[PDB]
Structures are given as structure tokens and as C-alpha cells.
Amino acid sequence: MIDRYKHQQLRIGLVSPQQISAWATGEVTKPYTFHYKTNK
């Protein structure tokens, strides 16, 4: 008979700076985790 064909692939690759930006947009610019007073 004919096989029930199933074509799936996953690939890894090194990521461009453009793709890194496209993931986020998003820039973290401050070393702060959580406010002490508001706990926000």
C-alpha cells in the first residue's frame, strides 16, 4: 500500500540580531528587579 506520509522537521540555527529584536518587540535597560516600597 501507500504509506501515510508525514513530513515534519525541526531545525536549530544561530540567530541574527534582527531576529533577537523581532522576538522582543522590548529593551531591558535597568538592573532593577522589584520596587522596595510598592513591591511592584
Q: How many residues bind another protein (CB under 8 A)?
A: 3
Q: Which residues contact 40 (CB under 8 A, 6 or more apart)?
A: 34
What letter would DSSP give residue 31? -
- Comparing CB distances to another protein, the nearer of 13 and 26 is 13
- Rounded CA separation 29/37 (Å): 21
- Comparing CB distances to another protein, the nearer of 7 and 35 is 7
Identify residues 3-32 at the interface with another protein (CB under 8 A): 7
Residues lying near another protein in the complex (CB under 8 A) are found at 1-2, 7
